[PDB]
């Protein structure tokens, strides 16, 4: 959709394969803090939160724990001790038009810094004086939702990168999303050590 009021999904009650995650071909950048990719493939959790969105290429460096910038200070801000990984794809074809793939309007005017995971979708007029632009014009009539103008002439740094961030919660965990090892046919008619689900 947009980095403005991003899209989310709460995965639970499944077997997290990961065989494609960070192993598909067109992935551009993937990096997690606290967890190794393979450990992730053997780690287990209670629930998962996926938060996908689209940002400008030159702003990918701002999606990081406590990282400071524009998109990470006034648009969408992730905690400082956030453990998990993000992945970003250069959608320089998937979301772009010579006419301007700016359907999405990122956030450029905010009253106060963001709390971690604070959806702040709003339609107001940041201003200086008494009234907003509904009754004033020129001075103090600013609107935080600015288009991107994604078009192909834009260089890489300004190509819409689609980014997806995974956050594993572990409080009180009747963990419903696991399963890295499930095979090997049983030997019969011989004294054998078996390990049936423990």
């Amino acid at each position, epitope marked *: 959709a947009s980095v403005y009021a991003w899209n989310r999904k709460r995965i639970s009650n499944c077997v997290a394969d990961y065989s494609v995650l960070y192993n598909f071909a067109p992935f551009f950048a993937f990096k997690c803090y606290g967890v190794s990719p393979t450990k992730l493939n053997d780690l287990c959790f209670t629930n998962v939160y996926a938060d996908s969105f689209v940002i400008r290429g*030159n*702003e990918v460096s701002q999606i990081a724990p406590g990282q*400071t910038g*524009n998109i990470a200070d*006034y648009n969408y801000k992730l905690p400082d001790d956030f453990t998990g990984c993000v992945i970003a794809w250069n959608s320089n074809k998937l979301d772009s038009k010579v006419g301007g793939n700016y359907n999405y309007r990122y956030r*450029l005017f905010r009253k106060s*810094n963001l709390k971690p995971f604070e959806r702040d979708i709003s339609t107001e007029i940041y201003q200086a004086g008494n009234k907003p632009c509904n009754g004033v014009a020129g001075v103090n009539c600013y609107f935080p939702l*600015q288009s991107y*103008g994604f078009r192909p002439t834009y260089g890489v740094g300004h190509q819409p990168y689609r980014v997806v961030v995974l956050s594993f919660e572990l409080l009180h965990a009747p963990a419903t999303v696991c399963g890295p090892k499930k095979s090997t046919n049983l030997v019969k008619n011989k004294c054998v050590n078996f390990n049936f689900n423990g």
Partner: antibody
Amino acid sequence: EVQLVESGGGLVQPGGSLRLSCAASEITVSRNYMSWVRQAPGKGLEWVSVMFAGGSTFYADSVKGRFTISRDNSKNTLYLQMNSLRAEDTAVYYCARDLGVVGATDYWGQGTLVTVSS
Amino acid sequence: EIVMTQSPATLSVSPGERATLSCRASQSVSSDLAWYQQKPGQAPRLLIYGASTRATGIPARFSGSGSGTEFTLTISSLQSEDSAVYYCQQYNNWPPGYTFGQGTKLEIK
């Protein structure tokens, strides 16, 4: 009228400190995107610093680690502390309110010269 | 860090005629620009931002153009007071950062 008036400009011996101040009128600063610019005699301009509306500030790389912006919100004014002024920092400093895509920097300050002993 | 180069350096044109000023970029600046006229003695003044949008008040006599790595400002009829320095400011990277040009000296007769 809408304006930005500056202070702190002067002369100081190398390694010394200084503090630049920026006052405004008929317009607020606490809730306004602020940007300090400077100009060496005869050359172009360069963005020096910025303070946001939440407090998270930023500085250029050439002056990173040495200058610190602050603002007395109570009386609608901006400040920039400088230290260890070397031969480069001799310049005229300007105060600016930059909006960006919705109108680029417009209202500026008369400027203020800041030179060093030599 | 896109380095901008203005051209020409100086210009002396008879009153009443047209004037053409070029501003040259080193990378893709699409339509992120602005033009400032810094009359000698005080801060600059914005004339034309983005690609060609005329800043409020700014006489229609000015016209900006160009995109990519090359931009141009054009003046219809220079009056005696148009003599000043002009700078093309780009902002393809708004998040605190900016990079200016070398300036152009325009005079009359």
